[PDB]
Design an enzyme around this catalytic site. Structure first.
Site, PDB file in Angstrom:
ATOM      1  CG  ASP A  83      59.843 -29.534  91.743  1.00  0.00           C
ATOM      2  OD1 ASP A  83      59.840 -29.143  92.885  1.00  0.00           O
ATOM      3  OD2 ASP A  83      58.951 -28.902  90.858  1.00  0.00           O
ATOM      4  CG  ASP A 106      59.537 -27.227  96.556  1.00  0.00           C
ATOM      5  OD1 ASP A 106      60.066 -28.324  95.748  1.00  0.00           O
ATOM      6  OD2 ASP A 106      58.641 -26.354  96.311  1.00  0.00           O
TER       7      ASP A 106
HETATM    8  N1  1HQ Z   1      67.866 -23.999  94.944  1.00  0.00           N
HETATM    9  C1  1HQ Z   1      67.279 -23.848  94.115  1.00  0.00           C
HETATM   10  C2  1HQ Z   1      66.202 -23.824  93.060  1.00  0.00           C
HETATM   11  C3  1HQ Z   1      66.436 -22.667  91.940  1.00  0.00           C
HETATM   12  C4  1HQ Z   1      65.373 -22.570  91.251  1.00  0.00           C
HETATM   13  C5  1HQ Z   1      64.336 -23.352  90.979  1.00  0.00           C
HETATM   14  C6  1HQ Z   1      63.320 -23.393  89.984  1.00  0.00           C
HETATM   15  O1  1HQ Z   1      63.482 -22.662  89.101  1.00  0.00           O
HETATM   16  N2  1HQ Z   1      62.235 -24.301  90.226  1.00  0.00           N
HETATM   17  C7  1HQ Z   1      61.037 -24.373  89.480  1.00  0.00           C
HETATM   18  C8  1HQ Z   1      61.152 -23.610  87.945  1.00  0.00           C
HETATM   19  C9  1HQ Z   1      59.839 -23.603  87.320  1.00  0.00           C
HETATM   20  C10 1HQ Z   1      58.846 -24.307  88.057  1.00  0.00           C
HETATM   21  F1  1HQ Z   1      57.350 -24.486  87.428  1.00  0.00           F
HETATM   22  C11 1HQ Z   1      58.825 -24.810  89.334  1.00  0.00           C
HETATM   23  C12 1HQ Z   1      57.584 -25.544  90.195  1.00  0.00           C
HETATM   24  C13 1HQ Z   1      56.819 -26.573  89.275  1.00  0.00           C
HETATM   25  F2  1HQ Z   1      57.840 -27.294  88.848  1.00  0.00           F
HETATM   26  F3  1HQ Z   1      55.866 -27.196  89.957  1.00  0.00           F
HETATM   27  C14 1HQ Z   1      56.679 -24.469  90.783  1.00  0.00           C
HETATM   28  C15 1HQ Z   1      57.190 -23.823  91.823  1.00  0.00           C
HETATM   29  O2  1HQ Z   1      57.635 -24.774  92.864  1.00  0.00           O
HETATM   30  C16 1HQ Z   1      57.940 -26.009  92.482  1.00  0.00           C
HETATM   31  N3  1HQ Z   1      58.322 -26.953  93.587  1.00  0.00           N
HETATM   32  N4  1HQ Z   1      58.218 -26.594  91.338  1.00  0.00           N
HETATM   33  C17 1HQ Z   1      60.081 -24.993  90.085  1.00  0.00           C
HETATM   34  N5  1HQ Z   1      64.410 -24.621  91.771  1.00  0.00           N
HETATM   35  C18 1HQ Z   1      65.330 -24.623  92.666  1.00  0.00           C
END
Ligand code: 1HQ
Ligand code: NA
Ligand code: NA
Length: 379
Positions: free
Chosen positions: A37, A222
């Site tokens: 991530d 991201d």
């Molecule tokens: N292609 C693709 C893809 C599909 C799903 C996910 C996913 O589930 N991320 C995810 C799940 C839970 C979180 F909490 C986070 C967070 C958390 F880790 F900060 C918050 C939302 O944004 C980001 N970047 N990360 C990401 N990521 C990328």
């Protein structure tokens, strides 16, 4: 430098569930699969038997675990986790041949965080300490890696979409993973990987918005977000152009809002009615930009788990944002992306694995002449 055969193909995933890398934590090593991530900065892993988890970090089995005696409560817009902070020894089996002592948040309670059916059980936040929870004195994993070893301060990501896979090259770049040249845009501030978009075109037609609207209130790269998210006013203008460009077929309204899927008879998705999308990014030199161009293959995502269809269904994966532009897996799957932290810049090249057809390909082209690129940043 330039060749890291042992790291190629070290990412896996499923459509809609993100890309993960295998990691080990503790002594003896416990193997866990960890979501990559670039949009967050904590290394946080399930540490209790949540029913969705295949595996979780069992601190009691680790002789090298050290408790920091500090909890952390981390709510997001969707979902939350809570956990206990410690340090332990961490490795990446298909990564550099090194072991580091890193911070780990052991998650003991979560809501809407883990995905039921996914194969990962923690997140590796690769961004900077400024957005670490609870504050910036919690050193992120990659910072610890670079402080404690000779691994160079950069990593690169090749996300190959639809099972999905790809490569995370830690400490370098592998030239077999892209074609043509890398073009670099400055990291505007080290917190997220924040960049500046200077122009947006739909099928070569400029949206002609004040460029500050493209970065309101920031624009970031991201890997932990699926969609291309656009600031609301930009989304409204972008969708209106895409509808215009596509209007030989008629779709329900809800489709464009991501509220309904659209489906075609297998093997006949008409990619050719949908336009390409180009983002011009601020370049390395004054008044110089470059552009990256993606296809409908990136922004129309296949949805396979559709248990009331025959039949090939897609979700529109550009969505409105209240948090600025988010160049998620929709943008990243077209490109090999280099997070060159040592020089505070992000490189883009055409990915050797991106999904395309016989008529169009993703593209990274430059230089272009763009003036007043500093006014595009929002303060
Ligand atoms: N292609 C693709 C893809 C599909 C799903 C996910 C996913 O589930 N991320 C995810 C799940 C839970 C979180 F909490 C986070 C967070 C958390 F880790 F900060 C918050 C939302 O944004 C980001 N970047 N990360 C990401 N990521 C990328
Ligand atoms: Na070092
Ligand atoms: Na190459």
């Amino acid at each position: 430098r330039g060749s890291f055969v042992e790291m190629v193909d070290n990412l896996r995933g499923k459509s809609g569930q993100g890309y993960y890398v295998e990691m080990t934590v503790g002594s003896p090593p416990q193997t866990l699969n960890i979501l990559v991530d670039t949009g967050s900065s904590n290394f946080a892993v399930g540490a209790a038997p949540h029913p969705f988890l295949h595996r979780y970090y069992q601190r009691q089995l680790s002789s090298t675990y050290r408790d920091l005696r500090k909890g952390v409560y981390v709510p997001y817009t969707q979902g939350k986790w809570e956990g206990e902070l410690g340090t332990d020894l961490v490795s990446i089996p298909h990564g550099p041949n090194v072991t580091v002592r890193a911070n780990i948040a052991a998650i003991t309670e979560s809501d809407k965080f883990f995905i039921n059916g996914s194969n990962w059980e923690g997140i590796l936040g690769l961004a900077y300490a400024e957005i670490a929870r609870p504050d910036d004195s919690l050193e992120p994993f990659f910072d610890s890696l670079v402080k404690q070893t000779h691994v160079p301060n950069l990593f690169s990501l090749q996300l190959c979409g639809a099972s999905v896979g790809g490569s995370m090259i830690i400490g370098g770049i592998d030239h077999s993973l892209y074609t043509g040249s890398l073009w670099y845009t400055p990291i505007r501030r080290e917190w997220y990987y924040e960049v500046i978009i200077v122009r947006v075109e739909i099928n070569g037609q400029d949206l002609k918005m004040d460029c500050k609207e493209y970065n309101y209130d920031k624009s970031i790269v991201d890997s932990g977000t699926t969609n291309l998210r656009l600031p609301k006013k930009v989304f409204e203008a972008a969708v209106a152009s895409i509808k215009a460009a596509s209007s030989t077929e008629k779709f329900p309204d809800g489709f464009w809002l991501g509220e309904q899927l659209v489906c075609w008879q297998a093997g006949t998705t008409p990619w050719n009615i949908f336009p390409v999308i180009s983002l011009y990014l601020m370049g390395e030199v004054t008044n110089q930009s470059f552009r990256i161009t993606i296809l409908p293959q990136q922004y129309l995502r296949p949805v396979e788990d559709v248990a009331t269809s025959q039949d090939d269904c897609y979700k529109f994966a550009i969505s409105q944002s209240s948090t600025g532009t988010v160049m998620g897996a929709v943008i990243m799957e077209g490109f090999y992306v280099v997070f060159d932290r040592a020089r505070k810049r992000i490189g883009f090249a055409v990915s050797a694995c991106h999904v395309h057809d016989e008529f169009r390909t993703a593209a990274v082209e430059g230089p272009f002449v763009t003036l007043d690129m500093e006014d595009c940043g929002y303060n």
